[PDB]
Amino acid sequence: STTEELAKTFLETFNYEAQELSYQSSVASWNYNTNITEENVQNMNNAGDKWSAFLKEQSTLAQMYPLQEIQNLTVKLQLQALQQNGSSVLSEDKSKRLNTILNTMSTIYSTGKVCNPDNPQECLLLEPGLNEIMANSLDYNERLWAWESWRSEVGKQLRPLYEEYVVLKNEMARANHYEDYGDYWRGDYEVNGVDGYDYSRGQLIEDVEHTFEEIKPLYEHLHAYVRAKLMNAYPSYISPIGCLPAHLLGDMWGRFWTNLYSLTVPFGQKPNIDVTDAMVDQAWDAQRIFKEAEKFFVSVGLPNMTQGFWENSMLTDPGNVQKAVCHPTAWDLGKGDFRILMCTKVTMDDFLTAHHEMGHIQYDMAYAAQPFLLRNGANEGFHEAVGEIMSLSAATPKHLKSIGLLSPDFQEDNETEINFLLKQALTIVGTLPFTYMLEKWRWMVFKGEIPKDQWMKKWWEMKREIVGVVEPVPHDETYCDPASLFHVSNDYSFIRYYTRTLYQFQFQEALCQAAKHEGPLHKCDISNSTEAGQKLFNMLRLGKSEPWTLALENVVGAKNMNVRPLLNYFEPLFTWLKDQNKNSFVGWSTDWSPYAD
Amino acid sequence: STTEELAKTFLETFNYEAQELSYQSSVASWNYNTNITEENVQNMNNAGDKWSAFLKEQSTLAQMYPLQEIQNLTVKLQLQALQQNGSSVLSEDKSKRLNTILNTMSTIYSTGKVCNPDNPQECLLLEPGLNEIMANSLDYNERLWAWESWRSEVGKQLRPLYEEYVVLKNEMARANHYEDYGDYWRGDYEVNGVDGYDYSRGQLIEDVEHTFEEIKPLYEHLHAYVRAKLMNAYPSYISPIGCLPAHLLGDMWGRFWTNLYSLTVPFGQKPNIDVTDAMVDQAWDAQRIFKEAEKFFVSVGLPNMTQGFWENSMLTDPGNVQKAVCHPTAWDLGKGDFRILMCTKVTMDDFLTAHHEMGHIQYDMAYAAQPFLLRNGANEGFHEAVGEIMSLSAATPKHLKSIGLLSPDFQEDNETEINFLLKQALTIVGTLPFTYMLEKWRWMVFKGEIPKDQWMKKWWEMKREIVGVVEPVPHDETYCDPASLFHVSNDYSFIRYYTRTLYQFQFQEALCQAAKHEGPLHKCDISNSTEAGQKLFNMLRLGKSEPWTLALENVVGAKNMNVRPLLNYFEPLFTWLKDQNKNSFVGWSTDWSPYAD
Amino acid sequence: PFGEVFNATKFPSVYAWERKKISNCVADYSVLYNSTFFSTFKCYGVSATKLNVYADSFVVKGDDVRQIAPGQTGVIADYNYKLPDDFMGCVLAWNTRNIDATSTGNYNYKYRYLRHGKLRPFERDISNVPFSPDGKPCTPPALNCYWPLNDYGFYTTTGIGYQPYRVVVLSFE
Amino acid sequence: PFGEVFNATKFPSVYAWERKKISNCVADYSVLYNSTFFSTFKCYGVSATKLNVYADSFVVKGDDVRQIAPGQTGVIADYNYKLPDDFMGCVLAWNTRNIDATSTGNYNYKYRYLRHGKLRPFERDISNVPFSPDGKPCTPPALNCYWPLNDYGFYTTTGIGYQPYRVVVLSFE
Ligand SMILES: CC(=O)N[C@@H]1[C@@H](O)[C@H](O)[C@@H](CO)O[C@@H]1O
Ligand SMILES: CC(=O)N[C@@H]1[C@@H](O)[C@H](O)[C@@H](CO)O[C@@H]1O
Ligand SMILES: CC(=O)N[C@@H]1[C@@H](O)[C@H](O)[C@@H](CO)O[C@@H]1O
Ligand SMILES: CC(=O)N[C@@H]1[C@@H](O)[C@H](O)[C@@H](CO)O[C@@H]1O
Ligand SMILES: CC(=O)N[C@@H]1[C@@H](O)[C@H](O)[C@@H](CO)O[C@@H]1O
Ligand SMILES: CC(=O)N[C@@H]1[C@@H](O)[C@H](O)[C@@H](CO)O[C@H]1O
Ligand SMILES: [Cl-]
Ligand SMILES: [Cl-]
Ligand SMILES: [Zn+2]
Ligand SMILES: [Zn+2]
């Protein structure tokens, strides 16, 4: 028996052993999140330790089989996946220490608090403390305070830790034959052997940068309009040719402009798309929210939820006495056990949230029959992309009508549509230069292209150049502003947010095309269109099985990320913008700052 | 004074006089074709004599100007067109006689009636009586009757006249230094002195056939597919390898397979693309058709019809008491007086024709800007192609939806697409061999290659070889079947319909490029494309002031006619026809006869 | 006394235009302001009042009206009736299909289509002498000799640009 | 004496499935036909009665139940219990989550996942010897040595396809 025969038998033994440890890991981890007891945190650790120890043991064993001795993608792919070496490639102490760093950065961002200098008896966290301010405060200075505090207290603390984090993390990636840690992360998008369907790590930067140029015009116009609008809410604070003060953007970082809607809304006269109140009028309970979601997915020819989902899911918060974490999630425990943990409130945002979450379950269900190691989205940018799709079709005024939620007399005049579209751009378009920029910095830091002594100098240079955004207070290298955002100081790649964002529009357009939809792409609703489901299921059932390029081509009919569908969605807003900006400056000066000098 | 000098003044004079005479001729000609009164046939002749005599009196005087000594091309062409010898180049008797043949043939055709063997009182005229039978009967025998009566009554009558017409028209041809009348007609396409834009007479034959070879595979299948379908319609009258019987093709001659749609429709449970029923159901009238087609040309950027067009056109049959010639015609009387004469019926073919006809009018308006002598289509085929360009866009389901002849909810799939492409093929593709074959016979006859004692033998040989059609009863040389067509017995070149259909798609491929059109060519509607409108108009206003070769190149980028566009337009159907045809013979034997029994 | 020019039963040919002198008179002008009857009302002076004139009348075809203005390219401005480059008042014109055109064809109106040099402003050529493009006295039916006054021919059924238009030019001094 | 088979308090692991021979008896089969208690009831012979047999008990996973038919890809078919190509009677399955699974995990049910060559119809492999894919004796913890027998792991919370199913195969001669 050859190397390939000895590999299958090795993998098979893995899948079976992995199913049990992993199922135990998940159930324990679930019981925790749903029943926070000291007996449970003990169990989640118990099962999480075994399952992790096992992986390590297995990977080290899996490395005893050379993967270029295998002419068989399926198995080759599995063996490669299991070859997550880890920080085990480093020495005993460069692994313990690194994990020490990883944990401390985490615990600092999670426990970090700042206190009101005018009332030091009230110390605020990020959530919900500072966050509330950054979303709702109209006071420039209060806003300035929170913004600066966060980066000045927990920022400076993470600075040293982050520096060592970068050295330690880089060694690892080098020892795994990657250029740097960045290159390690780009790896997720790589494809070796299939022809044309291949994709290199660097091709990602290329395809991100090329595709990003085609976004500037839109963003610049979005920027120009919001700048004008903000000038009104903070007169004298903002220059009409300048960048936007970083602390005025709707949240702690300006990752999303969502909360700017109140003061950037195009037609403030027009009322709600919000059916929050329409839903209550019919005493709708969680049962109906999900049954509906379920009905949505069955409409495109996909399956009912599993009996176990209805039996084992947590649909409503028990309040006090048995408390739970309430962040909405889709759980794929294994052994055909699917469930959602979500503290359903009765809002529209939650009705829609159910459609996102249940997208995941539908995806997870589709790729169940794949080899254990291969059950996951095609890349990091896939799962959420499928999630957002569902949210998009459900929220269309066409769909709320269909459900019997929107008043059947409400017509789609040119104004309600730009209103909504702007709200969309504030979150979807707004976040793209921020996301690109963030990784751009991160990537360059890992290559050595940005020295320690110019970390912050180069960050803000890029926030000005790339994002149109400026520090309201100047920052020396005592700060580490980037790490003051969850993903940075918690070691998660951040480019998925970009690639997904495009994927999801690629999906949409192609799914709506499959579905004979007539109007603007933004009013689309794939509901009732089975041939859409089929076009989607074709890639949904693949999991991590075949290269994301083919996975995409299955649904869109092209081997790459194309930004063109993204523009298409926002096309009627883009025109309005170009005209609204008739006498506004479009673009920014990198030189002007609010503290000036 | 020089020469180019003295020439201008003469042309100027000719121009201002010509206009006056030519208007009086048309306004005469018109009042006849809309009121066939005795005093009107008088007047129509009169002005038309005072006009032809004039041109003759002026043609001679034109020759007195050495054109190959003039350096302004604008005036030379004008001078050149006026240097036309016509038919007065024949002797005294040979001119009155030819004109008598022509007139009699015209009258034998228009006055022909057949009377039922079972009813010497019921007689039917071609239009509507016979024609209705041919467009609608499912009765083998009825159709056999109509078809044969027509060729026995009118056809035999015409035979002697046609033979003598051949001889007299050849004599005029040779007297004007042409090989034969065939070569004479082939002249329209000729261009001398331009380099790379020249085109010779014998070069058209070469081109038509070169290009017809490429159309064969498509026609062959269409044929196969319709044969199978006609076998179900007429059980046991057709061989699965035989040519189609000529009285079964949907009209009196099989010029168009259009009326075979109802019995050849690919997918008949689909919502009908023949909007005739839709139109009737919505109680549309002639006004609605034309007013609708006007709206189409406005949408691309062209002008409305003129106050005169609406006041003066005849869009319906007056009935009896006031009788007219119903042949659809696009009139350019002169002095910016444009109208359409049409006995509009509420059908889809008439809807399409309205656009075609109005197409002509729009072309005529466009080149009203030109010197009198240059106010025409770039060649005989340009006008017809322009008509058909419009008809191309208006017939798309996309456009029917838009006018509301198709439900706004009408959803396009691959079956509706095939239905549409099939119906288009029946008309467009199916006329190609018929037309090509009709002309070749004529051409050959004029060339002398065919003797009197073989006239019908060679027609029917060619019907079998080239068109795959067979006479249902045999025909000795008392018969003259070609003359049963209006164009044959009313002395009109036919190949125009061939060239037209090529140019047609050439133009469309360029026009949809201009309208920034997405998918396959058959899905393009140029409506609302001012850009596409602009392109067309730019070649419209040139009139006959340019060689068609250059004129064409300026629209589409090609010196010659090209079949590629047509072929692309039909591709999806070709591919589908090939697979539909997998259980039947594709092609035909020339030996099977419905009468060899 | 304006309703004696416009409102005149008859009007002359362009090449033979008439001029009416208007002195010692009061005109309100409102007879012209208050009118959608006029298809053309272009003033190269103003649009006001002083209660104080030369009116030129003639018939031209629709598309020839555009030549009745300062500047202007040919045939009606060139050989018939030329307005001076600056010097100007108002130019009124109106569609007279139902008056000067007959469904059978009206050819009374003439114009000059051949002349040995452009007219100066306000000049008036009345001659019917046969024209030769190189000096030469003429006698028809000889070749390269033409009678220089063509008829219009105004039918009821023509396009607007071919229909007859009565035009009155007002001058001030 | 069929109730002594269906309703036996415990069931065998597939790899060590039990054959119980029934002769000199009369049965109605009505005790079987009528019952939504049975998830799978697929016969591969007939559907009548004669009052005359082998009964094979065991447990597999929901998704495995399909493998207990003539044909079938394998693992449970391949290495544990193989039905014969043509020859056959009936096959009865049913959900036993409440009996054969716990919220903690139940791992008493074994199956074989490695073997040199598939089984012959009705063959039974009871051996538990360390395995290497090219023969050769084996001594784990060594690489490429594995224990051929796996534990099922049946939990209340799993999906139906992962729930334990008590299966009974009836064979006719
Ligand atoms: C021949 C081939 O390429 N496909 C097989 C596939 O059928 C099977 O699932 C796998 C075993 O894990 O091995 C191979 O990849
Ligand atoms: C300026 C010049 O010499 N060109 C003229 C052209 O303008 C005129 O329209 C044409 C008609 O006779 O003759 C010449 O081509
Ligand atoms: C300007 C133009 O060319 N179109 C006009 C349109 O304005 C008008 O409303 C309509 C009604 O008579 O006639 C024409 O379509
Ligand atoms: C042919 C076509 O698509 N016409 C559309 C028409 O349906 C639409 O209502 C109108 C108003 O914007 O514009 C376009 O002309
Ligand atoms: C007699 C003649 O054809 N002249 C034309 C003239 O009408 C026109 O204004 C000019 C514009 O370029 O071109 C020619 O010179
Ligand atoms: C050796 C292996 O594990 N491959 C299996 C095989 O049982 C099956 O017959 C084939 C279907 O084509 O592909 C896989 O599912
Ligand atoms: Cl920051
Ligand atoms: Cl015939
Ligand atoms: Zn999600
Ligand atoms: Zn035509």
Ligand 4 atom nearest to CA at B527: 1
Distances (CA, A) of A466 to A416, A461, A472, D75: 31, 8, 17, 57
Q: Which two tokens stand for residue D2?
A: 């069929």
Ligand 3 atom nearest to CA at B294: 15
Residue A522 falls in the annotated catalytic set: no
Pair D111, D63 in one domain: no
Among chain C, residues having any CB pair with chain B shorter than 8 Å are 105, 113-114, 133-134, 143-144, 146, 150-151, 153, 155, 157-162
Number of domains in chain A: 1
The pocket of ion ligand 10, defined by CB under 5 A, consists of: B 387
Tell me the C-alpha distance between B502 and B214, whole Å. 12
DSSP state, residue A151:
I
For residue C40, the SS3 value is strand
Q: Which domain holds residue D168?
A: 1-104+154-173
Long-range CB contacts for residues C42-47, cutoff 8 Å, separation at least 24:
C42/C69, C42/C90, C42/C91, C43/C88, C43/C89, C43/C90, C43/C91, C44/C69, C44/C70, C44/C88, C44/C89, C44/C90, C44/C91, C45/C88, C45/C89, C45/C90, C45/C172
Known binding residue B463? Answer is yes
Tell me the C-alpha distance between A507 and A385, whole Å. 8
- Report the half-sphere exposure of B47 (CA within 13 A, side-chain side): 21
Tell me the C-alpha distance between C165 and C97, whole Å. 8
Contacts of C158 (CB under 8 A, 6+ apart): B23, B308, B335, B336, B337, C101
The alpha-helical segments, DSSP class H, found in A151-285 are 156-175, 181-186, 201-213, 216-233, 261-264, 276-280
Most D CBs within 10 Å, among A3, A4, A9, A306, to test the D interface: A9
Chains A, D: CB contacts within 8 A come to 51
Q: Which position has the token pair 């709206």?
A: B295
The residues pairing with D110 across neighbouring beta strands, listed in sequence order, are D151
3-state secondary structure A331-377: EEEECCEEEEECCCCCCHHHHHHHHHHHHHHHHHHHCCCCCHHHCCC
Tell me if D87 sits within 8 A of D69, measured CB to CB: no
Nearest by CB to B27, from C146, C157, C161: name it: C157
Tell me the C-alpha distance between B481 and B441, whole Å. 11
Kindly state if the Cβ of C73 falls inside 6 Å of ligand 5.
yes
Tell me if A386 sits within 8 A of A559, measured CB to CB: no
The residues pairing with B331 across neighbouring beta strands, listed in sequence order, are B339
Question: From B412, which residue of chain A is nearest by alpha-carbon distance?
Answer: A516
Evaluate whether chains A and D are touching (3 or more beta carbon pairs less than 8 Å apart).
yes
Q: Which position has the token pair 């020859």?
A: D87
**How many CB atoms neighbour CB B319 within 10 A?**
8
CA-closest residue to ligand 4 atom 9: B402
Tell me if A10 sits within 8 A of A62, measured CB to CB: yes
Phi/psi at B488 (nearest 5 deg)? -75, -55
Pair D39, D113 in one domain: no
Tell me the C-alpha distance between A145 and A256, whole Å. 20
Helix, strand, coil fractions of chain A, as percent rounded to 5: 60, 5, 35
For residue B220, the SS3 value is helix
User: B72 CA distance to ligand 2 centroid (A)?
Assistant: 7
- Maximum alpha-carbon separation in chain C: 56
Of B124, B186, B128, B118, which Cα lies nearest the Cα of B150? B124
D71-109 core/surface letters (b: 16 or more CB in 10 A; e: else): eeeebbbbbbbbbeeeebbbbbbbbbbeebbeeebbeeb
Q: How many residues are there in chain C?
A: 173
Q: Which two tokens stand for residue D58?
A: 């065991």
For residue C111, the SS3 value is strand
Alpha carbon B110 to its chain centroid, in Å, reads 18
Nearest by CB to A306, from D153, D155, D159: name it: D159
Tell me the C-alpha distance between D106 and A23, whole Å. 13
Phi/psi at A390 (nearest 5 deg)? -60, -40
The angle, 0 to 180 degrees and rounded to 10, between the axes of the packed helices A383-395 and A348-366 is: 140
For residue D169, the SS3 value is strand
Q: Which position has the token pair 């309005």?
A: A576
Q: Which position has the token pair 């000795």?
A: B476
> CA D138, D140, D145, D150 torsion: positive or negative?
positive
Phi/psi at C78 (nearest 5 deg)? -90, -45
Q: Which two tokens stand for residue B205?
A: 């034959």
Put simply, the answer to whether C157 touches B13 (Cβ < 8 Å) is no
Of A40, A577, A526, A66, which Cα lies nearest the Cα of A301? A526
**Got the DSSP string for B535-559?**
HHHHHHTTTTSS-HHHHHHHHHS-S
- Report the half-sphere exposure of B28 (CA within 13 A, side-chain side): 20
Most B CBs within 10 Å, among C103, C160, C162, to test the B interface: C162
Burial class (CB in 10 A: 0-12, 13-18, 19+), A97: middle
Tell me the C-alpha distance between A575 and A569, whole Å. 12
The alpha-helical segments, DSSP class H, found in B64-139 are 73-82, 93-111, 131-136
Strands D164-171 and D90-95 turn out to be antiparallel
3-state secondary structure A509-542: HHHHHCCCCCCCHHHCCCCCCHHHHHHHHHHHCC
User: B498 CA distance to ligand 10 centroid (A)?
Assistant: 13
Q: Which position has the token pair 């396809």?
A: D161
Q: Which two tokens stand for residue A367?
A: 């790729």
- Report the half-sphere exposure of B317 (CA within 13 A, side-chain side): 13
Q: Which two tokens stand for residue A30?
A: 């679930």
Tell me the C-alpha distance between B586 and B593, whole Å. 18
Phi/psi at A123 (nearest 5 deg)? -105, 125
Contacts of C36 (CB under 8 A, 6+ apart): none
R_g over Cα of chain C: 17
Distances (CA, A) of B196 to B72, B191, B257: 20, 10, 38
Ligand 1 atom nearest to CA at A12: 12
| Catalytic, out of B171, B294, B357, B546 | B357
The C-alpha torsion from B200 through B204 and B206 to B208, rounded to 10°, is 160
3-state secondary structure B371-407: CHHHCCCCCHHHHHHHHHHHHHHHCCHHHHHHHCCCC
- Maximum alpha-carbon separation in chain B: 80
Structure determined by: X-ray
- Report the half-sphere exposure of A331 (CA within 13 A, side-chain side): 29
Tell me the C-alpha distance between A564 and A506, whole Å. 8
Least Cα separation, residue D142 to chain A (angstroms): 11
Q: Which two tokens stand for residue B111?
A: 């006055």
The residues pairing with D169 across neighbouring beta strands, listed in sequence order, are D56, D91
Tell me the C-alpha distance between D38 and D34, whole Å. 9
The residues pairing with D131 across neighbouring beta strands, listed in sequence order, are D146
Tell me the C-alpha distance between A548 and A503, whole Å. 11
Kindly state if the Cβ of A8 falls inside 6 Å of ligand 1.
yes
Tell me the C-alpha distance between A195 and A29, whole Å. 41
Strands B469-470 and B244-245 turn out to be parallel
Pair C61, C117 in one domain: no
Tell me the C-alpha distance between D166 and D98, whole Å. 12
Q: How many residues are there in chain D?
A: 173
User: D73 CA distance to ligand 6 centroid (A)?
Assistant: 8
DSSP state, residue B13:
H
Tell me the C-alpha distance between A398 and B33, whole Å. 55
Least Cα separation, residue C83 to chain B (angstroms): 24
Tell me the C-alpha distance between A267 and A417, whole Å. 10
> CA C82, C85, C88, C93 torsion: positive or negative?
positive
Q: Which position has the token pair 């082998």?
A: D54
* Residue B177 zone, left/alpha/beta (φ > 0; ψ -120 to 50; rest): left
Q: Which position has the token pair 């700017």?
A: A260
For residue A482, the SS3 value is helix
Tell me if A508 sits within 8 A of A565, measured CB to CB: yes
Question: From B58, which residue of chain C is nearest by alpha-carbon distance?
Answer: C143
For residue A253, the SS3 value is coil
User: C71 CA distance to ligand 5 centroid (A)?
Assistant: 15
Tell me if B86 sits within 8 A of B132, measured CB to CB: no
Burial class (CB in 10 A: 0-12, 13-18, 19+), B236: exposed
Q: Within an 8 Å CB–CB cutoff, is residue B411 touching chain A? A: yes
Tell me if B336 sits within 8 A of C161, measured CB to CB: yes
Tell me the C-alpha distance between A535 and A507, whole Å. 10
Report angle CA A184, A190, A196 to the nearest 5 degrees: 160
Kindly state if the Cβ of B291 falls inside 6 Å of ligand 3.
no
Pair C10, C65 in one domain: yes
Known binding residue B223? Answer is no
Tell me if A443 sits within 8 A of A173, measured CB to CB: no
Contacts of B445 (CB under 8 A, 6+ apart): B166, B182, B455
Most D CBs within 10 Å, among A337, A338, A372, A375, to test the D interface: A337
Tell me if A225 sits within 8 A of A580, measured CB to CB: yes
Kindly state if the Cβ of A74 falls inside 6 Å of ligand 1.
yes
Which chains reach chain D with 3 or more Cβ–Cβ distances below 8 angstroms?
Answer: A
Tell me if B389 sits within 8 A of B359, measured CB to CB: yes
Contacts of C97 (CB under 8 A, 6+ apart): C154, C156, C163, C164
User: A258 CA distance to ligand 7 centroid (A)?
Assistant: 17
Of D100, D88, D92, which Cα lies nearest the Cα of D155? D100
Chains B, C: CB contacts within 8 A come to 50
Pair C91, C30 in one domain: yes
Alpha carbon A148 to its chain centroid, in Å, reads 25
Which chains reach chain C with 3 or more Cβ–Cβ distances below 8 angstroms?
Answer: B
* A125, containing H or E segment: none
Of A572, A539, A38, A550, which Cα lies nearest the Cα of A266? A572
User: A1 CA distance to ligand 8 centroid (A)?
Assistant: 78
Put simply, the answer to whether D143 touches A12 (Cβ < 8 Å) is no
Burial class (CB in 10 A: 0-12, 13-18, 19+), C46: exposed
Residues of B in contact with A518 (CB under 8 A): 408
Tell me the C-alpha distance between A128 and A120, whole Å. 18
Tell me the C-alpha distance between A472 and C96, whole Å. 75
Pair D65, D27 in one domain: yes
The C-alpha torsion from A381 through A386 and A389 to A395, rounded to 10°, is -120
Q: Which two tokens stand for residue A491?
A: 């070691």
3-state secondary structure D66-94: HHCCCCCCCCHHHHCCCCCCCCCCEEEEE
Tell me if B355 sits within 8 A of B396, measured CB to CB: no
- Report the half-sphere exposure of B391 (CA within 13 A, side-chain side): 25
Residues of C in contact with B375 (CB under 8 A): none
CA-closest residue to ligand 4 atom 11: B528
Kindly state if the Cβ of C71 falls inside 6 Å of ligand 5.
no
**How many CB atoms neighbour CB B189 within 10 A?**
23
Strands B329-334 and B337-341 turn out to be antiparallel
* A131, containing H or E segment: helix A131-136
3-state secondary structure B323-339: CCCCCCEEEEEECCEEE
CA-closest residue to ligand 4 atom 5: B402
Contacts of A155 (CB under 8 A, 6+ apart): A479, A480, A481, A483, A484
Pair C110, C27 in one domain: no
Q: Which domain holds residue B235?
A: 1-597
| Catalytic, out of A487, A517, A546, A553 | A487
What CATH number is attached to the domain comprising D94?
3.30.70.1840
Put simply, the answer to whether B308 touches C157 (Cβ < 8 Å) is yes
DSSP state, residue A453:
G
For residue C7, the SS3 value is strand
Kindly state if the Cβ of A454 falls inside 6 Å of ligand 1.
no
Tell me the C-alpha distance between A72 and A70, whole Å. 6
For residue A407, the SS3 value is coil
Tell me the C-alpha distance between B532 and B539, whole Å. 12
Q: Measuring from each residue's beta carbon to the nearest atom of ligand 2, which residues come in under 6 Å?
A: B 8, 72, 74-75
Pair D139, D149 in one domain: yes
Tell me the C-alpha distance between B526 and B508, whole Å. 9
**Got the DSSP string for A405-416?**
-S-TT----HHH
Q: Which position has the token pair 């201008």?
A: B8
Q: Which two tokens stand for residue A376?
A: 């996951």
Least Cα separation, residue A14 to chain D (angstroms): 11
Pair D82, D165 in one domain: yes
Q: Which position has the token pair 């009197």?
A: B452
* Residue C138 zone, left/alpha/beta (φ > 0; ψ -120 to 50; rest): beta
Q: Measuring from each residue's beta carbon to the nearest atom of ligand 4, which residues come in under 6 Å?
A: B 299, 399, 402, 527-528
> CA B32, B38, B39, B43 torsion: positive or negative?
positive
Q: How many residues are there in chain A?
A: 597
R_g over Cα of chain A: 25
Tell me the C-alpha distance between A173 and A181, whole Å. 5
Contacts of C99 (CB under 8 A, 6+ apart): C164, C166
Tell me the C-alpha distance between B523 and B393, whole Å. 9
Residue B487 falls in the annotated catalytic set: yes
Contacts of B455 (CB under 8 A, 6+ apart): B445, B477, B480
Number of domains in chain D: 2
Q: How many residues are there in chain B?
A: 597
Put simply, the answer to whether B337 touches C150 (Cβ < 8 Å) is no
* B529, containing H or E segment: none
Q: Which two tokens stand for residue B570?
A: 């039909």
Tell me the C-alpha distance between C119 and C122, whole Å. 8
